[model samples]
Target: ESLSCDASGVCDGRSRSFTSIPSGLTAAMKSLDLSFNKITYIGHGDLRACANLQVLILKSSRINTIEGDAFYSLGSLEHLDLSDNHLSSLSSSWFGPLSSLKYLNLMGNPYQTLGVTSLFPNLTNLQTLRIGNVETFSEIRRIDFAGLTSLNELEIKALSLRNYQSQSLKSIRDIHHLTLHLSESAFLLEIFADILSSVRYLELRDTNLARFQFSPLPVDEVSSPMKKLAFRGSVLTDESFNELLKLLRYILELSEVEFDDCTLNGLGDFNPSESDVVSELGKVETVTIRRLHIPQFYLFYDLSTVYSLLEKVKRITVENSKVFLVPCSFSQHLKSLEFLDLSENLMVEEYLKNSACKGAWPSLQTLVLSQNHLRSMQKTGEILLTLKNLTSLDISRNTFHPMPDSCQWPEKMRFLNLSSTGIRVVKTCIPQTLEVLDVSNNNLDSFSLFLPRLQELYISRNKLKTLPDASLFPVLLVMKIASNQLKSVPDGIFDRLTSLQKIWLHTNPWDCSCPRIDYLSRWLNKNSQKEQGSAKCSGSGKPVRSIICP
Candidate 1:
């Protein structure tokens, strides 16, 4: 990872190589990671320079073009990953020399047609076929996939199945993994169940279905070899969820089920209708509930309908849910749970105290309680400081009137979020292990807090008059104090944040008067690239010359 920042907003110290492929790399370099850089194009024997390259990876580097013979002599290349680029097509000639290519990932680029037999005709031994995230998915005929007869893994996305695209998959009956993004039209995809029954790993993502009536598809007696079923952002209804279980009832081998952003409304506490979802998932070891919402009134057992089912669940997330508290009834059964996300809730004193004593979550690592109404951290903060496995905590956006007089921070806590807490000053104890803190959007006129591992501080949109001394944060990478009531940055503050890259000073009513504008003018000239815009003198009647620094 390189240490540089820019206006592109991808400069969090995770990118390195740019303009040219990193040089010092010898031919002995087995696996190269040239990802997330500004690399644009690769062509004709470009990588041929690195003759011994087997697995070349260039993902998310804004790659738009790959010359016809760019991969000319990369015959030894087995795993060629060009995913997350800006390429438009995968012409047939590109892979003419890459006969040994087994895993070719042309995923994130835009390609409508696969050029029928021409695309994969050369790489007949390709085991995994991933063609997705296109500009516009066109009609893919049987001729388009005539060469994928030996394919074992197929992961595709963003497609219109109007032109027998689903039926074209019938030839690859021996596929091991099959992932499809139905693009809002989910269960309506009519395909040969034979194409689905053989895959052990399956992912159906971003489907907007009212009810998951897979009844229309020919999957009644399909003996599934499936062990994992991942539904990413699929709206599951009570009736549809129940039916979905029946659809997979025959697959006794099904163990891991992950639901990401799948909103199921009626799965809330009603007459306590026991869901077979738990029973269906009985054999499974993990069930990921991410951004999942049910009812907001009850703090605890919000998923009482499925609480009985989640007893054996290892990881559970209930972020952004209106959870006032988690009753001990359901809390006690969370013995098997680890990763709990009760962040962004309506949580306060009593609930924190109650949950603190009840659940001894031995494996809980991350606790996100941000964006709530946590006014004071007196007793509640005391309760959280004792979490055995807790390391990360986010109590940001809570309506804290002022910085607390005293609060016990967790000894092991590394990350904390107190942003938008309306604090004008800092008096609370700063944890020694604190790494990242966001105290932005508050009533602070002056900022001052010290932490050893401090890397990023988002203190923007506050009434910050000036920043703390820069010596407080030595290894800082990002410090945003923009959009504040500021006249000018303090003398030593900007100088000490040496390791810093991005620090925006936009939208401040700068006092651009002659004597006062002198320091601002020189400072702006010194860091012109870093402080590009918004250094405007909105504090008018000051001077017209204030607009442009001398």
Candidate 2:
């Protein structure tokens, strides 16, 4: 039983310490995953039995040699993953029969150069191709991608850009997504000037952006087709950052931008001299800065210039950084902001107490403040009350012990998540306008809250021993009350919730011997799909739904 195949012909042979393809493969198999094994040398007959296989994954299989006709019978294969192997060369013979391939990943191989002849011959249907990340993979040519006429994405990974021939990628003019992972190279801008005009999405990793400048184009030239750009695992200074903003003046189509795991040095002072370069700054609506490292702590940083650049951004997320306090300057700007996520930062009650700027984020609707140093629920709610238009709030993963008797909330709040807050009691702190509430993973003996407007309630992983009156939530649709101390559901608890569509009642002690569980068994018999999780009897370990009474 080395292979596990589903009824629909999808098979999995992953990580079975296999030396070659398992023997149970058949032509009816539609998908096969053979990744993370010891398979080497894919002979022609190894996969000939799986002629109808649409997906073949051999990633990290230690494969070094592939026979000339290894894939001769896989004409129906559409996705092939050969990444993280020991192949030193790539032969078209290995891909000759893959006419239906839409995705081909050959990354992490040891190939030095793509052969002079077209590697991907007759692969016009190929949409995504990823290859590279070997130090010696130093050159690329026009014929390397000769026949990918309909290719939509091209990803190249290299350790050095010793000889990246410009315009070498002209054969794949329709490629809209381009990703590059390389070290410092002066030819970076040359590549951009040559191929970036046709690309709509671009991502760079571990590549230095400060090495070169953009080749100047005519002012009236057609704007670059770029729409989204991202950088990962790099360092950005003031000068290197300005180069990005300056592109807006030329490529007005750029809308979304992101930076992850990058080091930012003195970014507080965005180049104001060129702020006016782009007549309109609101073209970019979404900006995400996550896990950023601020290197310069001694320098006086001003956020006004930074926030001003994002004046019209609709959504912004700055998480896992040293964001102790969000200055009022952020609210002064970002007039069109609607969503903000500042999770995993360092913010205490004092910071929230003093940082509540009047009328902040006029258009803000959703805010996520999870995984911070927040302690006082009252202070947190008082601060959120300033956001008059806010509807959803996620303040989970913080300590809110001794649950405040009554806390404030925004008048328009409709969704609230207070899970993992270490609160034991539920008082009158929640807003009346809430339609969805999550208070799971806490400690409480009993639960009773009057939420007439609530439609979904998550109260799992608690210490509740008794049930609340169903009249509390007239329109409740979904309720998760699993992993509690309840012995049995009251007779008319769920019958009162006419709109109830889904409920979780498993992982709780249920007395199913007699009439104590008769109501649950009768209700589940009528609406089985609405009931989630198995309601097992407390002592016999049998489903409570199977109970019979004389």
Candidate 3:
């Protein structure tokens, strides 16, 4: 496991040791995990040889100093985890070489100060980042979390309690999930309110606050409506809870609220009556209960009460807990119920499907039946067909062999995900309204003759050798035909699909050397501009790479 080092080479550090790495391991290694080791300072040459490395993890080590150019050669690295270290400051040059790194974790570090431009000069590809347990709140300035173009999830811990400037977090345009581990010093409600404006999931876990409060008056400038709000391990007073609810009411689209392991006696006083709860529920479309530890039976009653108040709900998802399977009568109040996700519960498919009367979900559009032991798609489809408005369906990761052909899809059905199913052939014609069809990872070998209006098709991981006819998809935009047995694309395939934008024809057996290839090349060249937007044909690096007929 150890690299061959000459007499001049020396491993420096208090507990530095290199017992082994894979033999012949060099810069081309794709992944390296060396956590809880004695390595401290990472020198310029420590990882300069790893050119193709994609993931590197060095956690819980005595890593203090990161020499400039430590990662000069890891151009392809995408993930780096460096948590639990003694680093106090980040050098701008330390991460300059990792242009492609996407996920970074530097939690439990002593670095209280950071500059966004200096620390992440070329982090254009970063998606998920975690930097927590900093010492001072002042260290988290406006520049700390700016210019992250593609960040989806961010977790940070800071020790300041000042008002959060919207401009500081405005640079994060599309953040979906956010977690903040604030120190006791950071207890301002406005700061949390600013964080909630743009996040989908906001978790305030174990912060230094004895009481949490929000301004009762609604802020007209708030734009984003948080979908999931969770507060755990904090003292929340009833007045603060009431203010929180008022603030949430201003979130016209807030869907779910979860409170766990926090003070609840305060809620008893401010608990909204059925009418008030219903009024608030009318503004939201969905609700979720998580880890509240309430009695399962009572939870359903509470939900039913809420449903009774907000009659416009379209979907309700109950997940990750022991909630009782209430009778169908409890959901009778939800007149606009269109989608219901009861996955991750102890309810059986039959019990849930048979709960309501036929056509109960009049507007139901989708039903998720995963992580369960559903034996058949027959009954599921039968129940789904009752909803005349149901359009999209997901029946993946289930055992539905020889899928029932009698099941009827709504005339408006547009998207269907039947991947990992036992259906072999799409003998039935998909609804003419269908646009996107995913039958991947299945036993099918050919395009379904039934799909007359399928504009986008995914048929990868099948045994198909050739397409049947391109004229079938008049509006097809993208076709994924990879990982199949096709030797070459059918002649005039693109000519028929005038609207095709991308044709994935990779990983197929093509006769590279032949008179037939020349003909195919000519044909491809003629239609290359239409289908591939000036993409070159295979084997030739020319821009006008097309099938040429010899």
Candidate 4:
């Protein structure tokens, strides 16, 4: 018998007579694809000679029984995809022969009794393992993959264990990425810490975790080098945030964090009196909060204490929050503060008026104040004058009939966003060094503006029909004239702007009956893509497309 015979007839599931794989063809086959085949049982000697096999695919097969030594001789196998199989019982020795396996996908398998150590103990070179459909028993310990030293990413789903002890994850010391889908009973603190200590990227998204007490893992044992930590759609509270801060304080390597749509309470209790919690969160750099409500009426002393504690904070963004007021001296302690975002806060004007600054914010640079009920623009100008180092200011989504003409901005101020305001005209002593100006979503008909160093201009979502003259904003690099009533721009309107990069003229009701719109479009496309990195838009969507004139 030769090893070159085809084994395609052995894939028929109804054939019970074929229990053993032929020996001659095992070592010579490099790749095996037995998907959608009815194979219930495999003997120990079925695949003993598969020495040089590298890839094996057995998805959607009726593989209910696998003898312990079925794969005892597959030494060179690297990849195995065994999804959609009826593998009820798995043994540790079943995979002990594959020493060089790297990728394994055992998803959609009805293997309810497989322990952690029983699956991949022998495959030391396994890099990615997907066992997302395994239903473990409650009495079974969290199977340790400690023997797989080279395993970097692991995904386990439908685990029914209640108490995940430290021993459950004691074996996974070198894993860098991990995703676990555990039941409500799997809230063991020590075991969670043991698992988290070995990974750099941990995502606990869409879990039914009610209370995550930090009492299990000692503070000194949690991993510090975490890069991205996402807790979206989880049952988390302010107490959980405090525990997380304590965890980060112990690890010292967490930089980026997100807690969107999670229950955020107890921040109101985070006053100056809670010194312990404040001290733990002083190291976090980037933080995002959504739909968070602060109940404390007075934030003066508490905010001051928080700022004094966080010395390394660079950006603090509070969106869709019901923050009624902020402390007058809150910005004084944030020495490294560069960006401050308070957008979509309906009570922003109230917070601003109450936040009476006793000193200047010397390091403050970017300030965003969009989607609020601000009646006066002069009050904003007064606040800008206090920050001598201010560069960018966004006062969009407010009520302002006439733009204020305040010359109290810092010399370094460059970007200004006055979009969505009820401004009929652009009447202000605009800064000469200003580069980006967005007056979109207004009621402007026509305007002539000139800023020698202006690089970007956004006058979209308005009623602007034409321009007054040419030679406006000579150094402009990008221009947006969308969603307006503009039939044509004046000749030589963008002649001085030699460094123009992108000009958006989409979504405008241009009169195709007129030839002026085509001529203006041709002139603006001359120097496109000239500037590389001059301006930055930090709003929710694209401002250029929203500024088209119709």
Taking every candidate in turn, the Cα RMSD to the unseen true structure, in Å, is 12.5, 3.3, 9.6, 9.5
lDDT for predicted candidate 3 compared with the true structure: 0.62
Please give, for residues 387-411, the per-residue lDDT of candidate 4 as tens digits.
7778998888988657566655666
lDDT of 1 by residue, 1-550 (tens): 4433244322232267574454444455455657788778776655776556567777788788778887786777777778888877777778888887899888877766665555776787789878877455555566666566656788876655434455566655467778887755542445425455566777887776545554545446666677887887887666667657654565667777778777776443234244444444556656655666553333533455455666666766666646777765566666666667776778887677676663556556777777766777666568775467778777776777555556687677777777777777766455657778887887776666666578887778888776667777888877777788777666546667778776677777777665566666666767666663446676464322343534
Weakest ten-residue segment in model 4 by summed lDDT: 536-545
Ranking of candidates on TM-score, top first = 2, 4, 3, 1
Error of 2 at 196 (Å): 4.2
**Clashes, model 4:** 14
| Count of backbone collisions in candidate 1 | 6
Clashing pairs in model 2, backbone N/Cα/C closer than 3 A: 133-157
Each model's total of backbone clashes:
6, 1, 21, 14
Model 3 Cα RMSD, Å? 9.6
**Candidate 4: where are CA atoms >4 Å away?**
1-161, 165-188, 195-197, 206-223, 233-244, 264-278, 293-308, 360-362, 405-411, 429-433, 483-494, 508-550
List the global CA lDDT of all models.
0.67, 0.80, 0.62, 0.63
